[PDB]
């Protein structure tokens, strides 16, 4: 049956044009692609696993699109935040994220990135308690994380290191997926309390009594006051070798840094891009705080880079670092959406009809995207480009013998006359 | 001097200000005592602790960093934020050690106890330091870490005094007692 597909997308348009909010269209597009992603995946020829991934990718694209256009377009401007110098860093961070939309967009994108991150299954047969093997062998004179740093790593039993590897890798995957809470649960329950405490340092300080404007979200102070310190402390910890590469990787991510080579070598376009947006973000916040004298000089223990990249440039670098992935045509759209250069690329792939034809999803996707765009933002895509796009997709509805659902697509030109 | 959105915030800021001045002053007093002690220590982690005794979180953190105690270093940076998560986590770690825990360094435990927010009030207690430090120094410990936000300055100081008899004849002691006694100063 699967050669139903076009119907599904077409179907959504019917429903929209017939209940005369348009963001639902896209939401449905997402679900549609996702549903299809499941079909080709379950039981299939290994020729299907490829086009299955091109559907999952499809789906993620619709999601990213929803998220960003919702934020950008459903922009109805709220009330400005009036801080005082007595206010906590927590509030300044919040203000920053309110006022600066360019940067919040980065947040949105990172959220999306996390959303779609793979995490291994929870490690089984995890041991009763930490470093149990070394303790049992004798020779651990102190039971604290810093003991084998104080003197040769030869102290720790092999099996203990191996388990620490399992743990830190799992925690890292959880952190990249945004699963910070699950990471704290794992830390707690796997007898890694100190690592947990480290993970608690992620929050900026807020106090409900002083920072009135969040006396709703909180009843008790939380987060840590000397954060610039925390951050250098973590970064330094991250650079200290004789630690597992995933642990160092974790601290790298937390400090707004770029994890060690041993770990970074396995990160893909999405993962890598995520890492570097994280860096942009971290740097931008800390600079925002410095520009408002909310950092205390004592805390500037160490040099961290102060110069934030632009999303343009991060994308550019990650691109040259992951060419295969980068060049994939829906991931190009992903970037195009991220930078807002989206009608730009529509008109572009339009002229590529004048190796877009070789890949099937593309001509569809661009067309439906163009439709959505002009629905949500009338004027968005040039009248001509709509004409050209629908023209060509329609002639494929003909080649598939689904003339049945052509009128729906007609509802966008007087050129429709000619059908 | 600066204007405040509402008046309970003002009250809160005034509390912070007073607290900061009191604790800067205590550090002024205990200063040479502790600096002497740091002079004579032969152990780095103990020095880190003493730096916490002078309410210098940053130099402690720095020495930690330098002495290859990095995790500790991270933990230290929390001292003086009253994050109840960290408080209960630190206490938990302390119980786990104090139930088996074949061996934990004597000063690392002290530092964790400081993170616990109740360094004498406790089950890994710094109360025995009664015999090694000026009463004022330990009071500094309660006042700086101790649980600043949930308590008023008075009932906090009172909390500390409830754990330690001060010498009858000592007048700066007397003033703390009169301050904490609040409801019945007279």
From Swiss-Prot, chain A:
Task: One GO cellular component term, please give it.
Answer: chromosome, telomeric region
Compartments reported by the entry: Nucleus, Nuclear pore complex; Nucleus membrane
In the record, biological process GO terms are:
double-strand break repair; mRNA export from nucleus; mRNA export from nucleus in response to heat stress; nuclear pore localization; nucleocytoplasmic transport; positive regulation of DNA-templated transcription; positive regulation of transcription by RNA polymerase II; post-transcriptional tethering of RNA polymerase II gene DNA at nuclear periphery
Entry keyword annotation includes Chloroplast:
no
The question of whether Amino-acid biosynthesis is a record keyword is answered with: no
**Annotated keywords:** Coiled coil, Membrane, mRNA transport, Nuclear pore complex, Nucleus, Protein transport, Translocation, Transport
Topology relative to the membrane: Peripheral membrane protein
Top-level taxon in the UniProt lineage? Eukaryota
Where is this protein primarily located? nucleus
The transmembrane residues are none
Picking any one GO molecular function of the record gives:
identical protein binding
Q: How does it assemble?
A: Component of the nuclear pore complex (NPC). NPC constitutes the exclusive means of nucleocytoplasmic transport. NPCs allow the passive diffusion of ions and small molecules and the active, nuclear transport receptor-mediated bidirectional transport of macromolecules such as proteins, RNAs, ribonucleoparticles (RNPs), and ribosomal subunits across the nuclear envelope. Due to its 8-fold rotational symmetry, all subunits are present with 8 copies or multiples thereof.
What more the UniProt record tells us is: Present with 8580 molecules/cell in log phase SD medium.
Q: What does this protein do?
A: Functions as a component of the nuclear pore complex (NPC). NPC components, collectively referred to as nucleoporins (NUPs), can play the role of both NPC structural components and of docking or interaction partners for transiently associated nuclear transport factors. NUP84 is involved in nuclear poly(A)+ RNA export, in NPC assembly and distribution, as well as in nuclear envelope organization.
Which family is it part of? Belongs to the Nup84/Nup107 nucleoporin family.
Protein name in the entry: Nucleoporin NUP84
From Swiss-Prot, chain B:
UniProt subcellular location:
Nucleus, Nuclear pore complex; Nucleus membrane
Coiled-coil intervals: none
Q: How does it sit in the membrane?
A: Peripheral membrane protein
Protein name per UniProt: Nucleoporin NUP145C
């Amino acid at each position: 049956y699967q050669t139903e597909r076009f119907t599904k997308f077409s179907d959504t348009l019917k429903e929209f044009k017939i209940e005369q909010d348009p963001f639902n269209i896209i939401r449905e597009f997402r679900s549609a692609a996702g549903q299809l992603a499941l079909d080709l995946a379950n039981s299939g020829d290994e020729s299907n696993v490829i086009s299955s991934k091109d559907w999952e990718l499809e789906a993620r694209f619709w999601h990213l699109v929803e998220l960003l256009l919702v934020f950008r377009n459903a922009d109805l401007d709220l009330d400005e935040m009036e801080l005082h110098p007595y206010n906590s860093r927590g509030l300044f961070e919040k203000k920053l994220m309110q006022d600066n939309k360019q940067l919040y967009q980065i947040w949105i994108v990172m959220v999306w990135l996390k959303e779609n991150t793979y995490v291994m299954e929870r490690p089984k047969n995890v041991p009763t308690s930490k470093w149990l093997n070394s303790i049992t062998s004798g020779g651990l004179k102190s039971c604290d994380l810093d003991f084998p740093l104080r003197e040769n790593t030869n102290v720790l039993d092999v099996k203990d290191k191996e388990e620490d590897h399992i743990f830190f890798k799992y925690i890292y995957e959880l952190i990249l997926a945004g699963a910070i809470d699950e990471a704290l649960e794992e830390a707690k329950l796997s007898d890694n309390i100190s690592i947990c405490m480290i993970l608690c340092g992620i929050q900026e300080y807020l106090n409900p009594v002083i920072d009135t404007q969040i006396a709703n979200e909180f009843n008790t102070q939380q987060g840590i006051k000397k954060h610039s310190l925390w951050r250098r402390t973590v970064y330094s910890l991250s650079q200290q070798a004789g630690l597992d590469p995933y642990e160092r990787a974790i601290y790298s991510y937390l400090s707004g840094a770029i994890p060690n080579q041993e770990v970074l070598q396995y990160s893909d376009w999405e993962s890598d891009l995520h890492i570097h947006l994280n860096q942009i973000l971290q740097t931008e916040i800390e600079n925002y705080l410095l520009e408002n004298n909310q950092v205390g000089t004592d805390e500037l223990i160490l040099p961290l880079p102060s110069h934030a990249l632009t999303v343009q440039e991060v994308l550019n670098r990650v691109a040259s670092r992951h060419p295969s992935e980068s060049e994939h045509p829906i991931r190009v759209l992903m970037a195009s959406v991220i930078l807002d250069s989206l009608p730009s690329v529509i008109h572009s792939s339009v002229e590529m009809l004048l190796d877009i034809i070789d890949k099937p999803y593309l001509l569809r996707i661009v067309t439906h995207l163009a439709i959505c765009l002009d629905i949500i933002n009338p004027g968005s895509v040039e009248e001509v480009d709509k004409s050209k796009l629908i023209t060509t997709y329609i002639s494929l509805l003909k080649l598939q013998g689904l003339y049945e659902n052509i009128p729906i697509y007609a509802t966008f030109l007087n050129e429709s006359d000619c059908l | 001097p600066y204007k405040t959105d509402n008046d309970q915030v003002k009250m809160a800021l005034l509390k912070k200000e007073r607290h900061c001045r009191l604790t800067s002053w205590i550090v002024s007093q205990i200063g040479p005592e502790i600096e002497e002690k740091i002079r004579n220590s032969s152990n780095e982690i103990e020095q880190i602790f003493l730096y916490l005794l002078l309410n210098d979180v940053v130099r402690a953190s720095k020495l930690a960093i330098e002495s290859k105690n990095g995790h500790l270093s991270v933990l230290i940076s929390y001292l003086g934020s009253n994050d109840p998560r960290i408080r209960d986590l630190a206490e938990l770690q302390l119980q786990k050690w104090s139930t088996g825990g074949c061996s934990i360094d004597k000063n690392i435990s002290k530092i964790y106890k400081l993170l616990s927010g109740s360094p004498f009030e406790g089950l890994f207690s710094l109360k025995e330091l009664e015999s090694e430090f000026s009463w004022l120094c330990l009071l500094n410990l309660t006042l700086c870490y101790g649980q600043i936000d949930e308590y008023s300055l008075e009932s906090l100081v009172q909390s500390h005094l409830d754990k330690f008899s001060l010498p009858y004849d000592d007048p700066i002691g007397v003033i703390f007692q009169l301050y904490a006694a609040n409801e019945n100063t007279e």
